[PDB]
Amino acid sequence: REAIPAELLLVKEDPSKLPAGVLQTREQLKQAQRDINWAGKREQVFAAVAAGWHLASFALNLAFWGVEGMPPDRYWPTSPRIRLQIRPGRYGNMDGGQRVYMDYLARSEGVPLN
Amino acid sequence: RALLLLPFSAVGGAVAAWQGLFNSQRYENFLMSEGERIWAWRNRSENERWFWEVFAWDRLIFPILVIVAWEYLVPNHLVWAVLAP
């Protein structure tokens, strides 16, 4: 079983014959580590900020929740047919339309009867 | 022994306390006070609401915007700058 002494396995590098500026100082190593750490999370941080803005808007809507705390508005009734002036007239309305209206209203209310 | 670590119960207790803050007589009193303030402010204003709901866009800002936009778009022609608008 071979031994291979460490003088044939280790690098005898002397930090004197190196060119000037090659040997990194502690401040340069700290700056490089900070840059690596920022580059390893920059896109994640920006995507999290955008998603956090969207989540803040959604949480504001959740705090709005329902209708409570809001007055009724005469400029904005809850029905667009009230807001505009839309009425059925002589052309279009037919007797069977009452049956179809009944079926659509049953489906919209959520009952399976017709 | 201690299963209390990773406190999902403690992070849900914030939502539980948030739900318990409302649906109380204090929140009902606050809502009725806000209704009183809304009623007072709605009786006070009565003009600014019509200005902001009817006048401000349709009869103040939108005609200005479409006239400026048309004059910025169409060529320097008598028909396109005067007669057609």
Binding site: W76, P80, L84 | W52, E53, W57, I61
Partner: peptide
């Protein structure tokens, strides 16, 4: 002066007009 003073009423008006314009865009659709 005037930095966030000539902006806040204008941004308030823009937000209100934008919301009413979205509601009226639903109305015209």
């Amino acid at each position: 002066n005037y930095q966030k003073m000539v902006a806040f009423p204008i941004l308030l008006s823009l937000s209100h007009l934008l919301h009413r314009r979205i509601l009226y865009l639903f109305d015209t659709l």
